[PDB]
């Protein structure tokens, strides 16, 4: 005797020793990315090509 | 027999209860279930509870 068995219920595992089908379908995907930047450019100039007389000493 | 008709006793009151269910056995006069997804969803829930997985 295997005990009471439901008639219309779907066949499910209920006790120790019962079998069950596992459909292994795994799809995992993780990603991450980052960046940082900094820039600085500086140019400066001053030139006196021709200096008038009253400015010579300066 | 007039005081019982004019007053109420403190603590002796009525409450309101609400719930959701399914009514079966209709003669083709039930939900269309195409415009009411919850009918089929809860029927599937009941069947799953009873052991049938649609």
CA B30 remoteness from chain centre: 15
8 Å CB contact of A6 and B51: yes
Range A5-30 burial, b when 16+ CB lie within 10 A, else e: eeeeeeeeeeeeeeeeeeeeeeeeee
Cβ–Cβ gap A10/B53 under 8 Å:
yes
- Whether B53 contacts B46, CB under 8 Å: no
Per the entry, the structure determination technique was cryo-EM
Q: What CA–CA distance (Å, rounded) separates B44 from B54? A: 7
Angle at A12 between CA A18 and CA A2, to 5 degrees: 55
Show the tokens assigned to B36.
Answer: 């009411």
The CA distance from A32 to A51, in Å, is 62
Cβ–Cβ gap A9/B52 under 8 Å: yes
Contact pairs from chain A to chain B, CB under 8 Å? 10
Contact yes or no for A13/A19 (Cβ under 8 A): yes
């Amino acid at each position: 005797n295997y005990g009471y068995q439901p008639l219309f219920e779907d066949r499910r595992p209920r006790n120790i020793g019962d079998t069950l089908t596992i459909v292994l379908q795994e799809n995992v995907s993780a990603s991450k990315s980052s960046s940082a930047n900094a820039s600085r450019d500086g140019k400066t100039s001053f030139g006196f090509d021709t200096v008038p007389r009253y400015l010579q000493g300066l | 027999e007039r005081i019982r008709d004019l007053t109420s006793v403190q603590g002796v009151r009525e409450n309101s209860l609400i719930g959701y269910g399914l009514v079966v056995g209709l003669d083709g006069t039930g939900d269309q279930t195409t415009q009411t997804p919850f009918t089929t969803q809860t029927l599937n829930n009941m069947l799953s509870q009873l052991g049938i997985t649609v």
